[PDB]
Amino acid sequence: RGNWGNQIEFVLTSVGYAVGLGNVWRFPYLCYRNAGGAFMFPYFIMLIFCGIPLFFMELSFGQFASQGCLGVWRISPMFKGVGYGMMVVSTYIGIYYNVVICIAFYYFFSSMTHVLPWAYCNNPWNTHDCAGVLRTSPSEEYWRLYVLKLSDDIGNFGEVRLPLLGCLGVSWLVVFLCLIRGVKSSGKVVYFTATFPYVVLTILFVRGVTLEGAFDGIMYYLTPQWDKILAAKVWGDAASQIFYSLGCAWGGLITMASYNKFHNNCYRDSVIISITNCATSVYAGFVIFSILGFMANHLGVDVSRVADHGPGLAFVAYPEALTLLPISPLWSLLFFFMLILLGLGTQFCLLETLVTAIVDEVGNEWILQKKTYVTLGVAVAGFLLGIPLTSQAGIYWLLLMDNYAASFSLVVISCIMCVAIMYIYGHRNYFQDIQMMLGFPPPLFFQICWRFVSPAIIFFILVFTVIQYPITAYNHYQYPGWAVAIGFLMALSSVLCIPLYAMFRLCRTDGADLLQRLKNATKPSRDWGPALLEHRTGRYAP
């Protein structure tokens, strides 16, 4: 199989995988959309009671078998569709993640001037409604009428934005060249990629907490609102954000943990990684809300109702406030470089684990010697599939994919995996496996969580979210019916992998009754257990 080499290497690589654009781009506007501190309490509850336990379960389940997200299902061969669903969601996410990366590239290239181009209203693309501070903002109108050239409907496919296509091509080429040249084999690139963003965040924090009005923004960011928590929308959003940011049902955690040694302490690593991820999100929220409050104080309005709701918050509200500071291009360059690094770090690991899973599934030696060709094919397919997201209607499709194809399907898949492990295989068997691996049983908190707490919370959230369903929208724009249907189909595509594969596997099982075939297809295979022979003892001994 192959080991890692050291524990700090695995920890740093997992930090690079986990902390990305979901800490600095998606978490801020998801927190702003849910009225600040009304989002924090469900977020922390869902982190404490569902996220860390499932993170630990996934890491231990990867480490015990020395198998990836597809080969670990020898424990129950009929439930192999969980890994296929994980792969489908990974493909969905990796199509549009790199489009977000290329938009960051475009802004980084545009920041290389003495004067920022979104600072004034005296440009050809500006209208008579433009009103700057040097309400229609110059930054918003730069974003909407110059960079995107947004259409009026999702079905209005206009022209392709050539600069965005160039940025997307450059991004894909960079990722491919990093993948095929063995960049991760160097300890200077991994260290830099997962450490410099913290320096940038520290500098931005120090710059933004010394401004007049920052305390008002911080207070809005941290003050709870007890009357906006009894709604299922905020709970669903918090669950989705937690699972997306921890990368639970992506499938790469199992593949990454399959390279760990048998007696490695996987219980401490999961805690470290989860705490680091959430602390990074909170720190970025501080950084953004400080100058949100400063800008609100400048404009004379409340901390809320100062910016629009949507994924463009980091591309519109932040630079418009940066424009009011001295040496603005420096801050802009730092911000966009940090975003680019965070995105590329996650994209590299996603593609690596996906290619590894495909190659392992195919099996034969012919595909082992043609791994570069598989990587090139996957990259070409990703670029070609992301091409239509760079048109005048691209942001509609991107928002739909973000909110439907990678939202709350991860929670369902993780819950199904947990239930399958705990109730078909047996919780006592898994506890014995964990004690075999670690030398002590898992703590009772995790046992209670896995057996009772997380599935019940997920079930209640699912039920009350399904009962109360609002239709997606984007700043007073109402999506048509067929777009909502396409979003539902995208959500269902990954979930449907489980029952379909279960029926396909049942169709080829021996027996004379349905119950007999159900019993035969659910018991562990002959090769389930530890990989190495000296670890093959107790209940697995020959």
The residue range among 48-56, 114-122, 305-313, 335-343 that interacts with Na ion, by the rule CB under 5 A, is 335-343
Give whichever of 245 and 255 is closer to Cl ion, judged by the CB atom. 245
Instruction: Round to whole Å and give the CA distance between 42 and 457.
Output: 12
Query: How many residues bind to Cl ion according to rule CB under 5 A?
Result: 3
Least distance in angstroms from the C-beta of 97 to Na ion: 10
DSSP label at 136? B
Instruction: Round to whole Å and give the CA distance between 538 and 542.
Output: 9
281 binding Cl ion? (CB under 5 A): yes
Note the helical H segments in 194-327. Answer: 196-208, 214-222, 232-246, 252-257, 266-299, 313-322
Least distance in angstroms from the C-beta of 27 to Na ion: 8
For residue 231, what are its two tokens?
Answer: 């709604």
The 3-state DSSP class for residue 211 equals: coil
Closest CA to 47 of 282, 220, 265: 282
Give whichever of 281 and 375 is closer to Cl ion, judged by the CB atom. 281
User: How many C-beta atoms surround the C-beta of residue 261 within 10 A?
Assistant: 14
From residue 498, give the alpha-carbon distance in Å to each of 196, 400, 417, 493. 41, 24, 10, 10
Give whichever of 264 and 281 is closer to Cl ion, judged by the CB atom. 281
Tell me the residue number closest to Na ion, measured at CB: 345
Give whichever of 19 and 378 is closer to Cl ion, judged by the CB atom. 19
Give whichever of 21 and 490 is closer to Cl ion, judged by the CB atom. 21
Element (H, E) at 38: none
Q: Which of 17, 27, 172, 250 binds Cl ion (CB under 5 A)?
A: 27
Q: Residue with structure tokens 């996603």?
A: 350
Give whichever of 17 and 479 is closer to Na ion, judged by the CB atom. 17
Q: Residue with structure tokens 């067929």?
A: 482
Give whichever of 28 and 386 is closer to Cl ion, judged by the CB atom. 28
Transcribe 382-439 into DSSP letters: HHHHHGGGGBTTHHHHHHHIIIIITSSHHHHHHHHHHHIIIIIIIHHHHHHHHHHHHS
From residue 437, give the alpha-carbon distance in Å to each of 4, 275, 340, 526, 529. 17, 23, 38, 20, 11
Give whichever of 18 and 116 is closer to Na ion, judged by the CB atom. 18
| Cα angle 365-367-369, degrees, rounded to a multiple of 5 | 75
Least distance in angstroms from the C-beta of 276 to Na ion: 10
Which one of Cl ion, Na ion, none is in contact with 455 (Cβ closer than 5 to 8 A by kind)?
none
Give whichever of 240 and 375 is closer to Cl ion, judged by the CB atom. 240
The residue range among 71-79, 280-288, 328-336, 363-371 that interacts with Cl ion, by the rule CB under 5 A, is 280-288
Query: How many residues bind to Na ion according to rule CB under 5 A?
Result: 10
Instruction: Round to whole Å and give the CA distance between 149 and 138.
Output: 15
Which one of Cl ion, Na ion, none is in contact with 20 (Cβ closer than 5 to 8 A by kind)?
Na ion
Binding mask 9-38 for Na ion (x = CB under 5 A): -------x-x-x-xx---------------
Which one of Cl ion, Na ion, none is in contact with 315 (Cβ closer than 5 to 8 A by kind)?
none
Which one of Na ion, Cl ion, none is in contact with 346 (Cβ closer than 5 to 8 A by kind)?
Na ion
Binding to Na ion (CB under 5 A): which residues in 227-266? 245
Q: Which residues on neighbouring strands pair with residue 478, listed in sequence order?
A: 473
Least distance in angstroms from the C-beta of 162 to Na ion: 28
Spell out the residues 6+ positions from residue 506 whose beta carbon is closer than 8 angstroms to its own: 78, 517, 518, 521
Q: Which of 346, 391, 403, 465 binds Na ion (CB under 5 A)?
A: 346
The residue range among 223-231, 241-249, 367-375, 425-433 that interacts with Cl ion, by the rule CB under 5 A, is 241-249
Give whichever of 85 and 345 is closer to Na ion, judged by the CB atom. 345
Closest CA to 205 of 341, 22, 334: 334
Which one of Na ion, Cl ion, none is in contact with 281 (Cβ closer than 5 to 8 A by kind)?
Cl ion
Which one of Cl ion, Na ion, none is in contact with 394 (Cβ closer than 5 to 8 A by kind)?
none
Which one of Cl ion, Na ion, none is in contact with 132 (Cβ closer than 5 to 8 A by kind)?
none
Binding mask 288-327 for Na ion (x = CB under 5 A): ----------------------------------------
Q: Which of 85, 94, 138, 345 binds Na ion (CB under 5 A)?
A: 345
Closest CA to 291 of 282, 308, 309, 303: 303
Backbone φ, ψ for residue 129 (5° rounding): -85, -5
Q: For binding to Na ion (CB under 5 A), which residues are involved? A: 16, 18, 20, 22-23, 245, 277, 342, 345-346
Q: For binding to Cl ion (CB under 5 A), which residues are involved? A: 27, 245, 281
